[PDB]
Amino acid sequence: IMNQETLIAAVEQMRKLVPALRKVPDETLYAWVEMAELFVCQKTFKDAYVKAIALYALHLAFLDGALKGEDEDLESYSRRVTSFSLSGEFSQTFGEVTKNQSGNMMLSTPWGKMFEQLKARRRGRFALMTGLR
Amino acid sequence: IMNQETLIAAVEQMRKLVPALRKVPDETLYAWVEMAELFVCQKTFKDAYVKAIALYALHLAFLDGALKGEDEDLESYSRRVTSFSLSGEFSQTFGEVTKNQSGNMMLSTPWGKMFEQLKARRRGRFALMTGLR
Amino acid sequence: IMNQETLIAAVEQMRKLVPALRKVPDETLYAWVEMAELFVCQKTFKDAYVKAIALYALHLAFLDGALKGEDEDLESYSRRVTSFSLSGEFSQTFGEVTKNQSGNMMLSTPWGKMFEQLKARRRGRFALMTGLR
Amino acid sequence: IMNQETLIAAVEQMRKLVPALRKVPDETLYAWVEMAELFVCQKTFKDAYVKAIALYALHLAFLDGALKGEDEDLESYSRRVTSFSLSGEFSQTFGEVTKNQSGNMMLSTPWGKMFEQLKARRRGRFALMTGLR
Amino acid sequence: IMNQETLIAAVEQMRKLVPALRKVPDETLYAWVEMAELFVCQKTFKDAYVKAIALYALHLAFLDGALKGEDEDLESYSRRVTSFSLSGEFSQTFGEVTKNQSGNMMLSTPWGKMFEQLKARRRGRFALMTGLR
Amino acid sequence: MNYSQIERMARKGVAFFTDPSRPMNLIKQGEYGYDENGFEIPPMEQVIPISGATRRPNAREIDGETIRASDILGIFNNDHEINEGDYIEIDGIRHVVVDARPVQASLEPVAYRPVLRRVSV
Amino acid sequence: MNYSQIERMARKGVAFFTDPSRPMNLIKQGEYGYDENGFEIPPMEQVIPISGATRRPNAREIDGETIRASDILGIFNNDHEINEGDYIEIDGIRHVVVDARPVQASLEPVAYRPVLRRVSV
């Protein structure tokens, strides 16, 4: 397993960056982090590894609202409630937030954009290769 | 599949990812995961095989509603409710969560996009081949 | 006739894949599977033949609401009801689920899409031929 | 960051640019600014480094709403509320602040554009390089 | 620091251009002008420097409502109210002013347009460069 | 047709606008009957748990005597069918279901939209 | 679900259409109880600050005596729970809460829309 105190620092920094996650039980966040660590490399950053991994895990959690409530969630992830209203009490509507235009799935949430810029500044967005002999 | 420990680990990881699945009977989870194991290659991953198989099973079951069937339902698999309302008590309006202009069909759920990016990390999505002899 | 116990396995497999089909009388499922076996090859899969035939039969059944009730379905298959409402009791509207783009009929239902991916994985999507002598 | 006077100067600059941050507890601003300083380069500016840090921090925190989450907020990061109204008391309709068909994502908030223009003036947006040796 | 009489002339002429700016405290304007002086140059004008700096600072302040109220502003810079209405007293709707079509960020406010017109008239909008030996 | 679909949709809708923290109870009294002399008491309560939705509060004024009473309308499920004179206990405050109003187009009503009036006056 | 969302929205909405310059107060009276001969007074006032919004003024006409009073409605927050018999101090003028009207679908109602009627006549 990746280093325990580094993982704790990651979850701590993510929590202080987004205060709303303080109420979420820690073990779900632990699982999300240890699942998201499979994507980033180490030697790419080697200084802001905690920052990058927290950003990427946050983007994964907030991708399409995949992270939901524990039991309050109902088994409908394929459907969204655009609007709802009670008769003489209140009413409300909703809608999309980002309206992605490129289909990169990193340019779909602010966290993904932030991590994309971090990666571009630290190493780059390029992959040039040729065959070995 | 090759044993039962892997199957149990995959189901448990899937439930950790989606806490709502803990109340669903585990038999359907076994069925879905053993159907999803037909698509994943353990030669490619060989360390995150459980993570990949759980991700793919989740996306596969959440494509357009296939796990939507509990013990009681009807043939609503061809049609989707857009709104429902009592005449003078409440009203509620639904809608699709994601548009899929690409048509690749694999980026239809967040878990699908996650699985594609994880596939690109482990072993590229290219397919380059030549006629032998 | 295709092998009896394999057919039984296929029908029970599709039933436990979609629990909502348990209430449907069995012989209709027998007819649907015996009709759908005409499409899939045998030696192409030769291992997951049961899974493939179950997938294709389910796709054929749920293509465009071809599978209906026994008598309660009115003799109207070329007409679909988009909405209906009682005077002061309730109301409801409806809509399409998939919004297909290429007219292949195969990427039109989730079952069809899954079968298509399984075929691509197992054998391929290519037909290269040349004149023999 | 390398010391404390630059950090305090950045926090003061942010607060005297936007005064609504005077009510926000300081430590959250500290976390945001020390995370945002990871992008700005001192050697380019060398005189208005504090100004650049403040601009980048403001734009990064106002990108799409990430500082919106204060000590109590729910998982509303994946959905945007467009309207809210009591049945017979008042109503309120919201909307997006800026349209961004360009997709560069630096042109998403006024602070981002100001920072980009500052970068252009101090050292052009260009990046021209050649293979060494 | 620019000369104190130059700064006083700039702020006072800005106030006489826009009299509604009289009510704001006189320190926020000092901060805004000291930030905006990092953009306007010297040898380009050398005559109407006060006019140019006042115009640029006004454009920066009124870019996208960057300059907000002192406390009456709520911590929501990423959301605009398109309409609001009380039940039986009044209603109001909101709307945009320019509808920019160039993505230049300088053809976005009247002050920016005036500044660019003055720049083109006085020096120009071009840059021809040749390599130095 | 397919009233089971209306049933499931109504169940999900009622579950949407409900709070699982308001103590709600339902009281059904019945099977009385007098003595040969002409006086007795029915000893039965039949109280059961229940949950649902409420809307449209209203206050009551009788003659200006400052009694401070209120009445509600409700939305409920189809379990433990509501009768025409049952008691509904809300937050320690008892109401009589003056009208049932089942949202009905068939038997076994999908849901009820009762009208409640506060007990006593 | 998530009634905290509605709580936050209602609080922001009330804060929108309000003026933080109108002197407003809330008066609660309680804990009375008579003497052995039958006369006494409850010595307490229980005044607290409060803010909100009002709408729909309406004059009061009785039979043409030219008394010239007025009555209004209110919109309030979810703190300092409003009872059915409280007094509201408005800009030097007192009213009695004749009607509470909590905008409610759960416990701890998100907001109140009371009806205020001017004291005396």
PDB file of C-alpha atoms in Angstrom, chain F:
ATOM      1  CA  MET F   1     -53.782   0.239 -17.439  1.00  0.00           C
ATOM      2  CA  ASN F   2     -50.998  -1.556 -15.499  1.00  0.00           C
ATOM      3  CA  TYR F   3     -51.991   0.008 -12.178  1.00  0.00           C
ATOM      4  CA  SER F   4     -48.923  -1.562 -10.551  1.00  0.00           C
ATOM      5  CA  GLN F   5     -46.872   1.039 -12.439  1.00  0.00           C
ATOM      6  CA  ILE F   6     -49.020   3.830 -10.996  1.00  0.00           C
ATOM      7  CA  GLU F   7     -48.599   2.146  -7.608  1.00  0.00           C
ATOM      8  CA  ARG F   8     -44.808   2.079  -7.752  1.00  0.00           C
ATOM      9  CA  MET F   9     -44.613   5.658  -9.043  1.00  0.00           C
ATOM     10  CA  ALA F  10     -46.940   6.885  -6.295  1.00  0.00           C
ATOM     11  CA  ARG F  11     -44.897   5.040  -3.672  1.00  0.00           C
ATOM     12  CA  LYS F  12     -41.657   6.637  -4.862  1.00  0.00           C
ATOM     13  CA  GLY F  13     -43.301  10.059  -5.059  1.00  0.00           C
ATOM     14  CA  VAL F  14     -44.692   9.850  -1.528  1.00  0.00           C
ATOM     15  CA  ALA F  15     -41.316   8.639  -0.264  1.00  0.00           C
ATOM     16  CA  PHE F  16     -39.715  11.661  -1.950  1.00  0.00           C
ATOM     17  CA  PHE F  17     -41.654  14.283   0.033  1.00  0.00           C
ATOM     18  CA  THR F  18     -41.424  12.678   3.480  1.00  0.00           C
ATOM     19  CA  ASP F  19     -39.208  12.997   6.542  1.00  0.00           C
ATOM     20  CA  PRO F  20     -38.410   9.793   8.494  1.00  0.00           C
ATOM     21  CA  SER F  21     -38.168  11.788  11.723  1.00  0.00           C
ATOM     22  CA  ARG F  22     -41.752  12.976  12.318  1.00  0.00           C
ATOM     23  CA  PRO F  23     -43.547  10.581  14.698  1.00  0.00           C
ATOM     24  CA  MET F  24     -46.808   9.698  12.969  1.00  0.00           C
ATOM     25  CA  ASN F  25     -49.319   7.193  14.287  1.00  0.00           C
ATOM     26  CA  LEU F  26     -52.682   5.849  13.176  1.00  0.00           C
ATOM     27  CA  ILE F  27     -55.439   4.898  15.622  1.00  0.00           C
ATOM     28  CA  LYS F  28     -58.341   2.626  14.632  1.00  0.00           C
ATOM     29  CA  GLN F  29     -61.131   2.129  17.165  1.00  0.00           C
ATOM     30  CA  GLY F  30     -64.049  -0.210  16.632  1.00  0.00           C
ATOM     31  CA  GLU F  31     -66.285  -3.015  17.874  1.00  0.00           C
ATOM     32  CA  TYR F  32     -68.307  -1.201  20.507  1.00  0.00           C
ATOM     33  CA  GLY F  33     -71.732  -2.302  21.749  1.00  0.00           C
ATOM     34  CA  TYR F  34     -73.912  -1.438  24.707  1.00  0.00           C
ATOM     35  CA  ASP F  35     -74.904  -3.429  27.778  1.00  0.00           C
ATOM     36  CA  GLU F  36     -78.410  -4.674  28.534  1.00  0.00           C
ATOM     37  CA  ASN F  37     -78.758  -1.638  30.825  1.00  0.00           C
ATOM     38  CA  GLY F  38     -77.417   0.874  28.308  1.00  0.00           C
ATOM     39  CA  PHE F  39     -73.870   2.005  29.093  1.00  0.00           C
ATOM     40  CA  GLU F  40     -70.335   0.661  28.583  1.00  0.00           C
ATOM     41  CA  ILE F  41     -66.938   1.593  27.125  1.00  0.00           C
ATOM     42  CA  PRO F  42     -65.045   0.231  24.077  1.00  0.00           C
ATOM     43  CA  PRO F  43     -61.634  -1.030  25.302  1.00  0.00           C
ATOM     44  CA  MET F  44     -59.470  -1.040  22.176  1.00  0.00           C
ATOM     45  CA  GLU F  45     -56.900   1.314  20.658  1.00  0.00           C
ATOM     46  CA  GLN F  46     -55.159  -0.338  17.666  1.00  0.00           C
ATOM     47  CA  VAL F  47     -52.335   2.159  17.198  1.00  0.00           C
ATOM     48  CA  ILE F  48     -49.818   1.541  14.399  1.00  0.00           C
ATOM     49  CA  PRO F  49     -46.852   3.435  12.969  1.00  0.00           C
ATOM     50  CA  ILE F  50     -47.121   5.275   9.660  1.00  0.00           C
ATOM     51  CA  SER F  51     -45.353   7.982   7.651  1.00  0.00           C
ATOM     52  CA  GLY F  52     -46.395  10.322   4.874  1.00  0.00           C
ATOM     53  CA  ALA F  53     -46.567  13.879   3.582  1.00  0.00           C
ATOM     54  CA  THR F  54     -48.523  16.964   4.632  1.00  0.00           C
ATOM     55  CA  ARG F  55     -49.388  20.266   2.974  1.00  0.00           C
ATOM     56  CA  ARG F  56     -51.630  23.341   3.092  1.00  0.00           C
ATOM     57  CA  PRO F  57     -51.789  24.314   6.776  1.00  0.00           C
ATOM     58  CA  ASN F  58     -54.778  26.324   7.927  1.00  0.00           C
ATOM     59  CA  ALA F  59     -55.787  27.974  11.178  1.00  0.00           C
ATOM     60  CA  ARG F  60     -59.163  27.833  12.914  1.00  0.00           C
ATOM     61  CA  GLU F  61     -61.197  30.723  14.316  1.00  0.00           C
ATOM     62  CA  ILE F  62     -64.529  29.980  15.973  1.00  0.00           C
ATOM     63  CA  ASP F  63     -65.850  33.193  17.549  1.00  0.00           C
ATOM     64  CA  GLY F  64     -62.742  35.149  18.584  1.00  0.00           C
ATOM     65  CA  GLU F  65     -62.278  33.210  21.814  1.00  0.00           C
ATOM     66  CA  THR F  66     -58.528  32.528  21.223  1.00  0.00           C
ATOM     67  CA  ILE F  67     -58.468  28.740  20.980  1.00  0.00           C
ATOM     68  CA  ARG F  68     -55.507  28.524  18.532  1.00  0.00           C
ATOM     69  CA  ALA F  69     -56.290  25.397  16.493  1.00  0.00           C
ATOM     70  CA  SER F  70     -55.078  24.273  13.065  1.00  0.00           C
ATOM     71  CA  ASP F  71     -55.853  21.724  10.350  1.00  0.00           C
ATOM     72  CA  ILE F  72     -53.861  19.971   7.619  1.00  0.00           C
ATOM     73  CA  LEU F  73     -54.212  17.966   4.407  1.00  0.00           C
ATOM     74  CA  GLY F  74     -52.101  14.871   3.831  1.00  0.00           C
ATOM     75  CA  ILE F  75     -50.729  12.435   1.267  1.00  0.00           C
ATOM     76  CA  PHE F  76     -50.181   8.800   2.205  1.00  0.00           C
ATOM     77  CA  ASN F  77     -49.392   5.322   0.870  1.00  0.00           C
ATOM     78  CA  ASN F  78     -51.711   2.338   0.363  1.00  0.00           C
ATOM     79  CA  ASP F  79     -50.672   0.286   3.405  1.00  0.00           C
ATOM     80  CA  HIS F  80     -53.042   0.171   6.379  1.00  0.00           C
ATOM     81  CA  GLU F  81     -55.934   1.630   4.402  1.00  0.00           C
ATOM     82  CA  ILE F  82     -57.482   4.779   5.849  1.00  0.00           C
ATOM     83  CA  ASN F  83     -61.107   4.756   6.958  1.00  0.00           C
ATOM     84  CA  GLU F  84     -63.537   7.645   7.168  1.00  0.00           C
ATOM     85  CA  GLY F  85     -63.244   8.327  10.910  1.00  0.00           C
ATOM     86  CA  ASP F  86     -59.768   7.221  11.986  1.00  0.00           C
ATOM     87  CA  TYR F  87     -57.390   9.161  14.227  1.00  0.00           C
ATOM     88  CA  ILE F  88     -54.026  10.480  13.019  1.00  0.00           C
ATOM     89  CA  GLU F  89     -51.417  11.344  15.651  1.00  0.00           C
ATOM     90  CA  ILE F  90     -48.893  13.966  14.494  1.00  0.00           C
ATOM     91  CA  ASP F  91     -46.119  15.174  16.825  1.00  0.00           C
ATOM     92  CA  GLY F  92     -48.273  14.619  19.893  1.00  0.00           C
ATOM     93  CA  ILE F  93     -51.228  16.419  18.279  1.00  0.00           C
ATOM     94  CA  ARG F  94     -54.267  14.333  17.365  1.00  0.00           C
ATOM     95  CA  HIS F  95     -56.480  14.920  14.335  1.00  0.00           C
ATOM     96  CA  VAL F  96     -59.564  13.179  12.975  1.00  0.00           C
ATOM     97  CA  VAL F  97     -59.550  12.167   9.322  1.00  0.00           C
ATOM     98  CA  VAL F  98     -62.721  13.948   8.239  1.00  0.00           C
ATOM     99  CA  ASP F  99     -62.369  12.839   4.605  1.00  0.00           C
ATOM    100  CA  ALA F 100     -60.337  10.022   3.075  1.00  0.00           C
ATOM    101  CA  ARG F 101     -60.241  11.029  -0.612  1.00  0.00           C
ATOM    102  CA  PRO F 102     -58.444   8.021  -2.136  1.00  0.00           C
ATOM    103  CA  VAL F 103     -56.789   8.911  -5.420  1.00  0.00           C
ATOM    104  CA  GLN F 104     -58.707   6.240  -7.260  1.00  0.00           C
ATOM    105  CA  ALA F 105     -59.455   4.867 -10.673  1.00  0.00           C
ATOM    106  CA  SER F 106     -59.623   1.236  -9.475  1.00  0.00           C
ATOM    107  CA  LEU F 107     -60.005  -0.793  -6.306  1.00  0.00           C
ATOM    108  CA  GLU F 108     -57.100  -1.049  -3.867  1.00  0.00           C
ATOM    109  CA  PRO F 109     -56.436   2.699  -4.122  1.00  0.00           C
ATOM    110  CA  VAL F 110     -52.904   3.697  -5.045  1.00  0.00           C
ATOM    111  CA  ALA F 111     -52.738   6.479  -2.443  1.00  0.00           C
ATOM    112  CA  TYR F 112     -54.855   8.601  -0.112  1.00  0.00           C
ATOM    113  CA  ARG F 113     -55.172  12.389   0.144  1.00  0.00           C
ATOM    114  CA  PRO F 114     -56.929  12.777   3.494  1.00  0.00           C
ATOM    115  CA  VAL F 115     -58.230  15.926   5.150  1.00  0.00           C
ATOM    116  CA  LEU F 116     -57.473  16.190   8.874  1.00  0.00           C
ATOM    117  CA  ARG F 117     -59.220  18.375  11.447  1.00  0.00           C
ATOM    118  CA  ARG F 118     -57.741  18.961  14.883  1.00  0.00           C
ATOM    119  CA  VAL F 119     -59.398  17.094  17.749  1.00  0.00           C
ATOM    120  CA  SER F 120     -61.660  18.809  20.325  1.00  0.00           C
ATOM    121  CA  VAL F 121     -62.166  22.304  18.844  1.00  0.00           C
TER     122      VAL F 121
END
